[PDB]
Design a protein around this ligand. Structure first.
Ligand SMILES: O=c1ccn([C@@H]2O[C@H](COP(=O)(O)O)[C@@H](O)[C@H]2O)c(=O)[nH]1
Ligand SMILES: O=c1ccn([C@@H]2O[C@H](COP(=O)(O)O)[C@@H](O)[C@H]2O)c(=O)[nH]1
Length: 124
């Protein structure tokens, strides 16, 4: 079975491009990472940095998570990210997304041993 760590990688990691994200990026990426299979996932962020760099965030700035948990960590550096947000006219199974590239600090929740990202919380 897929570990929480592997699920984070599937849902939130895209090291292959620096930013590129054509206007079509989210439409394609959300489908293939199986984020559209059962419903259209409303909001989802992909991070364009190395896995080691995103894993390192788990030892960076400890911040409160949105749900009140204490295991969130904010990256010291900005990172290349793409936000995918479902459009108003998007109709499952034809999931449609607006693609927005940005350079922001990421906030992830980390768990386990090894202590690794398991949830994408926010960007700031
Ligand atoms: O900037 C964000 C905010 C939320 N999410 C995803 O949306 C899910 C649900 O978010 P929320 O509606 O609980 O904020 C999160 O678990 C996370 O996967 C992102 O990818 N990026
Ligand atoms: O603030 C949070 C939110 C979620 N999770 C964990 O992240 C994983 C994926 O949750 P989600 O991003 O699908 O909500 C789960 O194992 C959940 O317990 C946290 O550790 N902290």
């Amino acid at each position: 079975k897929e570990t929480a760590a592997a699920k984070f990688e599937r849902q939130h990691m895209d090291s292959s491009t620096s930013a590129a994200s054509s206007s079509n990026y989210c439409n394609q990426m959300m489908k293939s990472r199986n984020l559209t299979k059962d419903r259209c996932k409303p909001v989802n962020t992909f991070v364009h940095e190395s896995l080691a760099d995103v894993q390192a965030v788990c030892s960076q700035k400890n911040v409160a998570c949105k749900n009140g948990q204490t295991n969130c960590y904010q990256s010291y550096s900005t990172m290349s990210i793409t936000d995918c947000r479902e459009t108003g006219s998007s109709k499952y199974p034809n999931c449609a997304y607006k693609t927005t590239q940005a350079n922001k600090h990421i906030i992830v929740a980390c768990e386990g041993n090894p202590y690794v990202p398991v949830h994408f919380d926010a960007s700031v």
